[PDB]
Design a protein around this ligand. Structure first.
Ligand SMILES: CCc1cc(C[C@H](NC(C)=O)C(=O)NCCCCC(=O)N[C@@H](CCSC)C(=O)O)ccc1N(C(=O)C(=O)O)c1ccccc1C(=O)O
Length: 282
C-alpha cells in the first residue's frame, strides 16, 4: 500500500532523505554524443544530457543530435520521448523528431516564460493565419484550432513534410497551470490533464511515442510519465498494490537522468498516483 507508505514518509518527514537514496541508486550511463563541441548549442543546460544508449537520433547524415531520450517501459508496454524545451535554433530539429518518430501528441508542462525568464522557445504557431516554416528541416507547422481551458489548453496543429508534401495532425497538450515555484496544490487537474492525453490516443501503441517536455525535460516531464506508467501498471497486474513507484522511477532513470528533480515532485507523484488510483480503479 503506497498510501500507507506515503503517510509514513510524511509522518517522519523523510521525503528529502528518500529522494536522495533514489539519486544515489539512479543509473549513470555515458552521454558522449551530447558533450561533443559541435552540439554545444543544441543543449539548454550544461548538466542535463541524454544517455547515448537511449538518445533519439535525427534521421539526417549531417548532425543527428537532439537532446531527447526514449523511455521504454517494457512491462507497461508504454514508451515516451522526454526532451528539453526546444531552443531558438533547435525547433526544426524538434519537429523533425516528431515527424520521424511518428508521434501523435506533444505534452508541454511549462510556459514559454516563467519567473520572468525564457524556459522554452515559442515552437508552435499562435495564430491560424501565421504558420511557421522550419527551413533547416523543411517542415511547415500550422495552428488549426485551439481549445483553451482553466488548467490546460489543447491545440490541433498540422505538420507538413515539405519534401514529400505529406501532412499529419499533431495534438498539443499544454498544461498551463503549473506553479512558478513548487508543485500543484492537489494532483486533481494534473490527473485530468493526463487522462485527456490518454483519451486522445497519443499514448497508444498505434502511434509513435509521445513527446513530453518542460524546460530540462526531466523534472515535470518525469512526474507526468511516472504517474501514467504507475497507473497503467496497477491497471494491468492482479495486485495493484504491488506497484512500487520508487522502483518504477529507477527503471525510468535507466533511460534519462534526473526524472523527478525534487522531493516535492516525488511527493507529488505519490499524490498523483494515489489520488489517481481511487479513480482509475473503478
Ligand atoms: C527550469 C527548471 C529546471 C532546470 C534544470 C537545469 C538545472 N540547471 C543549470 C544548468 O543551471 C539543474 O537544476 N541541474 C541540476 C542537475 C540536473 C540533472 C540531475 O539530476 N543530474 C544527476 C547527475 C547525472 S546522472 C547519474 C544529479 O544527481 O545531479 C533541471 C530541472 C528543472 N526542473 C524541471 O522540472 C525540468 O525542467 O526538468 C525543476 C527542478 C527543480 C524544481 C522545479 C523544477 C520545475 O520545472 O518546476
Amino acid at each position: 500500500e503506497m498510501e500507507k507508505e506515503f503517510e509514513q514518509i510524511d509522518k517522519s518527514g523523510s521525503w528529502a532523505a528518500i529522494y536522495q537514496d533514489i539519486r544515489h541508486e539512479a543509473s549513470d550511463f555515458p552521454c558522449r554524443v551530447a558533450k561533443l563541441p559541435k552540439n554545444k548549442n543544441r543543449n539548454r543546460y550544461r548538466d542535463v544530457s541524454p544517455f547515448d544508449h537511449s538518445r533519439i537520433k535525427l534521421h539526417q547524415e549531417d548532425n543527428d543530435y537532439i537532446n531527447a531520450s526514449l523511455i521504454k517501459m517494457e512491462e507497461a508496454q508504454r514508451s515516451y520521448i522526454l526532451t528539453q524545451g526546444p531552443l531558438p535554433n533547435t525547433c526544426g530539429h524538434f519537429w523533425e523528431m516528431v515527424w520521424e518518430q511518428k508521434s501523435r501528441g506533444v505534452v508541454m508542462l511549462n510556459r514559454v516564460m516563467e519567473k520572468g525568464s525564457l524556459k522554452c522557445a515559442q515552437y508552435w504557431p499562435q495564430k491560424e493565419e501565421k504558420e511557421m516554416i522550419f527551413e533547416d528541416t523543411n517542415l511547415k507547422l500550422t495552428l488549426i484550432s485551439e481549445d483553451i481551458k482553466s488548467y490546460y489548453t489543447v491545440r490541433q496543429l498540422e505538420l507538413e513534410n515539405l519534401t514529400t508534401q505529406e501532412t499529419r495532425e499533431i495534438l498539443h497538450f499544454h498544461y498551463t497551470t503549473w506553479p512558478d515555484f513548487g508543485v500543484p496544490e492537489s494532483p486533481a487537474s494534473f490527473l485530468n490533464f493526463l487522462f485527456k492525453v490518454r483519451e486522445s490516443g497519443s499514448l497508444s501503441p498505434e502511434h509513435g511515442p509521445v513527446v513530453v517536455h518542460c524546460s530540462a525535460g526531466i523534472g515535470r516531464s518525469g512526474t507526468f510519465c511516472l504517474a501514467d506508467t504507475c497507473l497503467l501498471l496497477m491497471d494491468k497486474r492482479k495486485d495493484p498494490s504491488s506497484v512500487d513507484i520508487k522502483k518504477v522511477l529507477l527503471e525510468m532513470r535507466k533511460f534519462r537522468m534526473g526524472l523527478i528533480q525534487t522531493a516535492d515532485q516525488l511527493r507529488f507523484s505519490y499524490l498523483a498516483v494515489i489520488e489517481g488510483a481511487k479513480f482509475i480503479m473503478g
